[PDB]
Amino acid sequence: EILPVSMTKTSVDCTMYICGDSTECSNLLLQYGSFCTQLKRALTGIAVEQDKNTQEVFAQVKQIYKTPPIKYFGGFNFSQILPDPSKPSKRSPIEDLLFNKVTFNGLTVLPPLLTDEMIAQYTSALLAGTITSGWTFGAGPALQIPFPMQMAYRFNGIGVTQNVLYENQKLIANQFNSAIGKIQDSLFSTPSALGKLQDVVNHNAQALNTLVKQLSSKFGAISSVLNDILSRLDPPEAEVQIDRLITGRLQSLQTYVTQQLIRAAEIRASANLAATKMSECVLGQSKRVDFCGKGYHLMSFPQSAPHGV
Amino acid sequence: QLSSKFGAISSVLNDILSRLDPPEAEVQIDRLITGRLQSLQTYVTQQLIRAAEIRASANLAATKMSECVLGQSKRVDFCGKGYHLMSFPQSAPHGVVFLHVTYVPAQEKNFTTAPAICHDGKAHFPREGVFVSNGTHWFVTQRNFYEPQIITTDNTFVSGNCDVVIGIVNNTVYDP
Amino acid sequence: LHLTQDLFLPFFSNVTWFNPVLPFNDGVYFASTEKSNIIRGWIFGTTLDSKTQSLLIVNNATNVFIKVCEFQFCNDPMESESGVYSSANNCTFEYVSNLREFVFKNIDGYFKIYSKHTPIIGRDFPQGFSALEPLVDLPIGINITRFQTLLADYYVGYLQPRTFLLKYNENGTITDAVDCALDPLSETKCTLKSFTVEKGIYQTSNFRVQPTESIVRFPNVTNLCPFHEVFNATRFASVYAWNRTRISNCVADYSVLYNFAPFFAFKCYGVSPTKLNDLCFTNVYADSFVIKGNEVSQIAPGQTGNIADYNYKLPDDFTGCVIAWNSNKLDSKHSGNYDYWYRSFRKSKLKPFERDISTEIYQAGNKPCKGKGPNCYFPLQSYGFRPTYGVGHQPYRVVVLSFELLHAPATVCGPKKSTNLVKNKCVNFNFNGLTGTGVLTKSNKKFLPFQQFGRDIVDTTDAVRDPQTLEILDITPCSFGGVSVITPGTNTSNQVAVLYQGVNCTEVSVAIHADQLTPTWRVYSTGSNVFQTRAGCLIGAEYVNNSYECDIPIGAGVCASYQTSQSIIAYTMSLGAENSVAYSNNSIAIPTNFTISVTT
């Protein structure tokens, strides 16, 4: 199950975009009220909202948990999800597939506060806590317990007596191993598994492309370039052209900002949903139907992805 | 923003009216009207977006009150950090404050555990407890609070013989 | 707290402490500290040589006598008697009535004087604050550029347009004004409209490296254009037989033509600079006209009439200049110049840039027309150009210049000296009329031998080659970006750190060195305090290898905080403590006690 969590943080300089470093244009823009201040405030709010979204989704763990060196868990494999030290950035093979599968004029893209390595470290800590201490570490101090006993408790959690697990442990371990193996092939052969994240990226790219392209529209003026108009007429005549260009570009900026605000609200809702899923599906067993999978839920494992989980 | 000229002669309608001819005055008034109307539209759109956000927050608060206050919730980290016990609402200006009461364990203790017990050549599993040992004697206790009890037939149930369970351990189950 | 932009004295500026003629740079600041009453007044004006109206100011004992007169000299070129002065002639305006501070401002013909006489205790320079109240506003309305002190221990400063934040007291008295371009902290203070700032990151204005030089590169072709010969042609053809004359491959220095003939009808419709010499345009298409007096009005875009419908039509989207002058003594005949003809009848309407050549008789009747007789009129009338006609009927000579300004992949530029090309430098460029700013480098583009410019996916000029060198080069723009300020709060301290987002540290250091950054304020930039990170260049603090919890988020896992030897430190964020659970085949931890915790 894939869920977007974040969005690219963008900051736009109102003055440079509207006026191409022209003092005459700046003087005229100065009489249009505090529009640029409002745009800057909205963009900063969006950026801090994105940072808070990722912080809330991935930082639900108190202490970084480390898995023991020996990784025997009663036949369970747990290799494609645990980090592999024999590579940079310490990412799991599935995380490697996820990252390898995905992929000017006053516009700046601010980098996220938490680097991808930190997100991977949070994911590893959560997964290690889940597989070592069970679900107890989410409700207080971590309590060690052998994995087959945790699985027996989880079977008791869905109305199945625990003797079933101790009777068919080998079969269940083999089934889980095969199921976890098939996921790699499912995400490898199928190229459109991560459709939503790419859709978010494409939407942001389209918005930026439209914003930069609309700088070349005349809006019923002599030309789309300020400097040529400035060195073409006396200021009193050129003022009308400057005003028309200013109005057009300001409308473009306002439209872009409103669209970005709506998209940010949608991604905020998605991030809240993802945080709820991590709190309930991962840090414990949920009895809600069709919430943590399709069937009787047992457990879940998170994996980091670009702008998502 | 009412004091912004918006590229006009002035920001007061009276001076514009009693300073120029009707056509130029009409043009200036049109520019001022366009600017002020755009300001109103921007304000209304911002208010709508904030209203949607607060609507989502209010829905969340209503759900929390319906599930954390009017009953005990089993959802993890929904009604507080830890196992939920109860909650109390408190009215606040333009909001609500929840006092979540949670149960948090402490004072860990280490023990040796076994999946089953093989007394009469038959496997035994705890009914709802966990088989723990303090080195010498074996006991069954709750999985959330240390309370050892003597292992007995009324405390366990038997399922199969002693060759399937991997970690099965010899012991004695005293029948009452 | 009012934020206003006006002419002010910049804080901590150089002040000359002292009779030279100090220039009046649109506002001066005068502060004299004496008890001998040597200072008595001032003189203002442009030349001050008894030609313009010089402003005279004198303060004898209590009141300032203000006069606007025309004088060669005043009393000023053992102080026992002096009332004679030198001259007070031609007075066109009259007015009467420690640490003497004065601000003199002139704007829109209004002379504003701000005074403040605070008898400070002692004679040391006061390290304090005191506002200046408006004394008088005189609307004399004269030009002033120079001024001199009048005599019978003072400071002079010049005002610059700045932005200031002023704090008004409950009784509306200005106390403790703060500048907005002095210090990074006193820019965030202006941004937040408060005198106290809190600990955290704060966005502020944007930085941009300014251009260093300006290079103009035009292709050499120094032939002057044959504009004068066209203008000084002996005889022009008929208005319907207008001579098209294409001009190309020469220098469009027609500014000299402004003086050869006394133009009276000089209107430019699409482009009207007085200094039309920097314009490079492709086609000019000079035209020659001979019209009457009350006909020049018909030569205009969107104009209709007999000429527009039968003789000559101008397009609505016309970009050019229309020039006309009198031709009484060179385009008239005593008996009537019966040689200039014009079309009068046509069974159709003209279109822009079209000429009529057919001379067949017009058909003005329903029956087919064959010769004269019935209602058939020849569509040609000879002008009776007589010297006795009035201004509205006197013949005029008109020339129409139709420009086509769309970049410049062609010839015909005005007179402008070329300049050497500069590579690898943020320099203004004017390649053949294509104007912009950027850094020019060697380009490996395979331009076919007809392409001049080059665009990108966004349709911005990304490459150009000048004909004088025929060498292809790209137009990568100069560096820019946003800057942010790190502060630990006003209460804690005043040290700040700046972060130039999305720029290399070497580039920003080079720009700082050769005084090229727009935010003229400079952090001290000591050694081992310039840190490079993916967020940008952070010249405000040193980097420490220790790990702490994040306090002031910067980005890319780097956070800043104020520690104590108090200074700001930048460190990599730590994700809490580490704890490895001792997992085992048979080992379980069971709690033996609990805690009832309550959270809000």
Ligand SMILES: *[C@@H]1O[C@H](CO)[C@@H](O[C@@H]2O[C@H](CO)[C@@H](O[C@@H]3O[C@H](CO)[C@@H](O)[C@H](O)[C@@H]3O)[C@H](O)[C@H]2NC(C)=O)[C@H](O)[C@H]1NC(C)=O
């Ligand atoms: C009307 O427009 C035509 C086309 O532009 C003009 O054409 C030619 O213009 C030149 C210069 O005025 C005339 O002089 C000749 O120039 C050549 C240049 O190499 C020179 O070698 C000759 O000795 C001579 O000076 C040329 O006669 C003329 N050709 C024609 C067919 O007219 C024309 O001058 C314009 N005349 C007007 C304003 O009525």
Ligand SMILES: *[C@@H]1O[C@H](CO)[C@@H](O[C@@H]2O[C@H](CO)[C@@H](O)[C@H](O)[C@H]2NC(C)=O)[C@H](O)[C@H]1NC(C)=O
């Ligand atoms: C857990 O799963 C991994 C992944 O398949 C197993 O690693 C494979 O081991 C076999 C036996 O040597 C190799 O032929 C494969 O090439 C390995 N796969 C990969 C992707 O390297 C591993 O054996 C399983 N069991 C344990 C205990 O790790």
Ligand SMILES: *[C@@H]1O[C@H](CO)[C@@H](O)[C@H](O)[C@H]1NC(C)=O
């Ligand atoms: C396990 O028990 C031993 C002694 O019984 C103790 O020393 C050790 O700390 C325990 N492991 C824990 C508490 O993780």
Ligand SMILES: *[C@@H]1O[C@H](CO)[C@@H](O)[C@H](O)[C@H]1NC(C)=O
């Ligand atoms: C373990 O529990 C038994 C219960 O009776 C007690 O007698 C004994 O002292 C405890 N400790 C050890 C080491 O057996």
Ligand SMILES: *[C@@H]1O[C@H](CO)[C@@H](O)[C@H](O)[C@H]1NC(C)=O
């Ligand atoms: C448990 O008891 C059975 C039956 O006596 C015996 O075969 C087995 O070895 C015992 N296991 C242990 C660990 O003592």
Ligand SMILES: *[C@@H]1O[C@H](CO)[C@@H](O)[C@H](O)[C@H]1NC(C)=O
């Ligand atoms: C302001 O005016 C009041 C009333 O005259 C006076 O008491 C007070 O001292 C004045 N100044 C300040 C700084 O409050």
Ligand SMILES: *[C@@H]1O[C@H](CO)[C@@H](O)[C@H](O)[C@H]1NC(C)=O
């Ligand atoms: C004139 O231009 C040509 C071609 O660009 C060039 O080769 C020549 O050196 C130039 N001459 C002068 C004097 O600039």
Ligand SMILES: *[C@@H]1O[C@H](CO)[C@@H](O)[C@H](O)[C@H]1NC(C)=O
């Ligand atoms: C800054 O420039 C230097 C040399 O010009 C280069 O080595 C370094 O990689 C640049 N910085 C970044 C972040 O690329």
Ligand SMILES: *[C@@H]1O[C@H](CO)[C@@H](O)[C@H](O)[C@H]1NC(C)=O
């Ligand atoms: C748990 O049992 C396995 C059986 O294969 C063994 O390899 C491993 O060492 C054991 N773990 C211990 C003794 O800590």
Ligand SMILES: *[C@@H]1O[C@H](CO)[C@@H](O)[C@H](O)[C@H]1NC(C)=O
């Ligand atoms: C549990 O901890 C509390 C401290 O909060 C202590 O007062 C109490 O005695 C402990 N319980 C036992 C059985 O020691």
